[PDB]
Amino acid sequence: GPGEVVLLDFAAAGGELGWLTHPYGKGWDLMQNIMNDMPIYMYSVCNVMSGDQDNWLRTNWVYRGEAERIFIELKFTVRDCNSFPGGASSCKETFNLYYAESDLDYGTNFQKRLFTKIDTIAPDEITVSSDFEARHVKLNVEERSVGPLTRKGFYLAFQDIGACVALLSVRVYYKKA
């Protein structure tokens, strides 16, 4: 908590960040839930009924400044693949976290091949159908770190390969030296 410098906080931006999605449509999608009387946002993908999924979500460019190592906190839900009818033969229960450093913001020009994998992100708890239908999802929290960073800025990216994932929070920070 103390002495943390926040470089990115998806949940606090209130649906305004509009991150790049590749492909657009049937891949990652910005969603809103307002059942708490307060809106919450998320990037969701659930293309579990067709195979060969390779869906990418890329944050906006992050200015590195003096940060030398970054810490990444994700909060997310994952639905049990058994929740789906049976042609879910390509369904997965993990997704992948990537990053890329660059000296310039490439804007809409997103190139998978420039990104390095940080880790596979797996849930401690999957959300089964009975809990989904009762609006009692299981929110997972995972943390990773990356360094050393040397360039003007960096991207984070999330690759889905056929899981039913809702990404509710992405918080990136570094510690003051």
């Binding site: 910005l30 969603m31 809103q32 839930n33 969701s44 009924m49 239908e133 994932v165």
Partner: peptide, 14 residues
């Protein structure tokens, strides 16, 4: 179709 999160709808700021 299948939703990753209950009662969620695609959203885009006005």
């Amino acid at each position: 179709x299948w939703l990753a999160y209950p009662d969620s709808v695609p959203y885009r700021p006005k």
